[PDB]
Assembly symmetry: C3
Homo-oligomer: 332 residues x 3
């Protein structure tokens, strides 16, 4: 390389490369710290109550143990928003649902079980389901669940006021640091009366379900009418070089949905088996509820000698490479 008093033409390039190395690779990219993931655990608590007046059954009270189907508290929990109830289900021959099939004569139906959407073992006769249409007689739960009529006004429409408390405990084992979403800032008197907000209360662990649904980008009424999916993501990007107080979680609410023309909403059927008058019966509930999925992911970085030395060596190497490259480009 010719050095006939080139001047600052390459001396400035050297300084620029050095500044870039010491700023972006070392400080910006946090190259002087080792990073590790966390082990996380989420507990959910839904405080609320819903009094639903249902024709033929009277008032029904839904408490924390009622709308919460897991009833133990985990990441993927579902809060009841609407339900279709078919009680007093006993095992006996009965007329099947009109959606399964319509046979005016008993010769039309065949003894056996349907391959698609099996509702029961067909006896072989067609018993009129009502005065208009006739269905085939099958053995199974006698009161069939007719989901054709879905309640337009949400029965558990108060779910937008059911307070959701999320206790997220994370632990970095590489540095042996255990933290919880209940930061030192948050305390008892705060949790006595507080609601989470993006800017007002960014650390409140009490998330209003309505507020969460609104932040996810969905209307609470239309979603509760049929069902939906909301994902709460808890990030724990922190720097352990500072005090532990400066580490705070970040909550982000996403809405997982799709086209409302094909299978709109989230619905599932469950049963409550019991024994009444010496007979084994059950109450079938087809519930459309919102599925809240909690995903916690974070990373902690602490100062370490080996990564710092490795980054310094790589920076010196790339500085030399860039100097040689710029010299060759200037000299062509």
């Amino acid at each position: 390389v010719r050095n006939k008093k080139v001047g600052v033409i390459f001396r400035l390039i050297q300084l620029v490369v050095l500044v870039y190395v010491i700023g972006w690779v070392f400080v910006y990219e946090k190259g002087y710290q080792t990073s590790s993931g966390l082990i996380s655990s989420v507990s959910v608590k839904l405080k609320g109550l819903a009094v639903t007046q249902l024709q033929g059954l009277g008032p029904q009270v839904w408490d924390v143990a009622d709308y919460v189907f897991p009833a133990h508290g985990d990441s993927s929990f579902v809060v009841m928003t609407n339900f279709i109830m078919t009680p007093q289900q006993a095992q006996g021959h009965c007329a099947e649902n009109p959606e399964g099939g319509i046979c005016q004569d008993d010769s039309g139906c065949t003894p056996g079980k349907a391959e698609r959407k099996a509702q029961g073992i067909r006896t072989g006769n067609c018993v009129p389901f009502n005065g208009t249409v006739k269905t085939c007689e099958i053995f199974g739960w006698c009161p069939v669940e007719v989901d054709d009529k879905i309640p337009s006004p949400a029965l558990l429409h108060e779910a937008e006021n059911f307070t959701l408390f999320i206790k997220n405990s994370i632990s970095f084992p590489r540095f042996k640091v255990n933290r919880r979403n209940l930061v030192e800032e948050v305390n008892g008197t705060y949790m006595k009366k507080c609601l989470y907000h993006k800017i007002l209360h960014p650390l409140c662990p009490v998330f209003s379900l309505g507020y969460v649904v609104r932040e996810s980008g969905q209307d609470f009424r239309s979603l509760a009418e049929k069902g939906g999916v909301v994902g709460i993501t808890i990030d724990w990007e922190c720097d352990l070089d500072w005090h532990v107080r400066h580490c705070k979680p970040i909550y982000q609410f996403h809405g997982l949905y799709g086209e409302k023309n094909l299978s709109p909403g989230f619905n599932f059927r469950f049963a409550r088996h019991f024994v009444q008058n010496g007979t084994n019966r059950r109450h079938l509930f087809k519930v459309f509820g919102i599925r809240f999925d909690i995903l916690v992911d974070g990373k902690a970085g602490k100062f370490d000698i080996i990564p710092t030395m490795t980054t310094i060596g790589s920076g010196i190497g790339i500085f030399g490479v860039a100097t040689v490259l710029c010299d060759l480009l200037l000299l062509h």
Copy 2:
């Protein structure tokens, strides 16, 4: 200094090859001009089917969607009932324990307390004969102790290979703010009315046959349902957002998570349905051997961006210079 005296194309061809490699595998193949991110996915599983099991002494039992589905709400890890051992009318009262726990001919042999390993009840101290042949120790617990020695070889819920499964997978890339569902624009309502998933015939069908899934996982459905098994369905969403969003389609892959059948074969678990009958708190115990289906979704997106393109061009120029210098030094020794 590098000697340059009519070297020829010996190094020019090397430079051209390096430039092609930079503009190719580095840029086009590895998608160096696109930024990538993961998705937030949620799975909803719905089982459609019904099983009529004729049990001696209990009559016909109808297992519907709310019966074989134990979570009953829909989770990535869900178990479908395939066989069960039923013990009804369990009430709290002193009774003879299981012969597997312990055999004592005389009451002095048993000691009052609780067994340290595989505890079945608080030992009363007396040995009440479980039957005419063997004598077990009296313990205070559920009087009809469950005897799982005889597992039904013909699967009670053997019709599980025809039960349909609908999986609704909702993914969302927040970096690009794009939401997608496994129900692609191609899959329509009339299609979903009558459809079964297949590898080549129906690669986008969201309706899976449990028997077909078990066959694709690499296991026989009968032997699995007899004792239990684990099937993992992986949903991939590798897509490129540079094209139209319609071209983004999920990929379903089935795996069988099994082990040596000589030590603890299958998946079994005991659950109890409690109730009140005749003013007494009783329960029905079920030891169910079922298939555990674990739904795992993993995917990544890609969208054009300026900064990745610039840094890839920079790295390409940097390595093109280094490779040229290295080839020149190797040629000149």
Copy 3:
């Protein structure tokens, strides 16, 4: 650059760079092995029994299907350690909990529902909860749960003898290799009588809950009194270049806890609905239990030729770069 009897000054640097390439880059970092992840499935089985004598209810036997709420078997499961029981809950008008509010006269309470911690629809009257304090009349579960007195002696304190058998089946699909925690070493007679230990029995699949809690860094009594979270991480770092017998899992126990002054432990509520004497009743249970979450992650490495050639090429390149750099640094 200048090459005139430079000596071994740069030859030693070249040799060191070559050793670094053929060593840490190739041997240590497994540059000749491609890596693949696994699909995992955890199955838990609890064995044990604990009779909890409760005043007014008699002996209560708790079996595997009782304290294990995820009876279907799940990685994230809760084991009942203490419970507050309120039996025979029927829907009707009753006095609310004194924690909600105290109104001496009926005019003090207002008809409707509470916004925070709703216990029931207020009827507008104040019926005395007892002889001392007076609360507002609400419609709901008549036996309101009074969780003020938490039993200091843990009812299910025998949870430290509840043997936990974990079956973790993993599969690497890229290499199509299936593995299970029941390794070839662990035989039937071994599983007949063994307890897991860090050094003594590092392969026994029977984990004692008390031992796990002790290894997590928490006392079992104080934790079971109010609840806790213990996470079991099962790693499967293996090298498929050797025989599959050498691949053994690694179990680690972490304790995910926080400040005990604000929301201590893990607690939830559930109910058992039934029909007695023609009336729909339930038994409410507020359970303080330990939450066990099983997280499984691993990596399998198999010899491949493409990563080997890539690492060889990168090593030759960085060796040439380091040679040029050291020569330029020596010649200034």
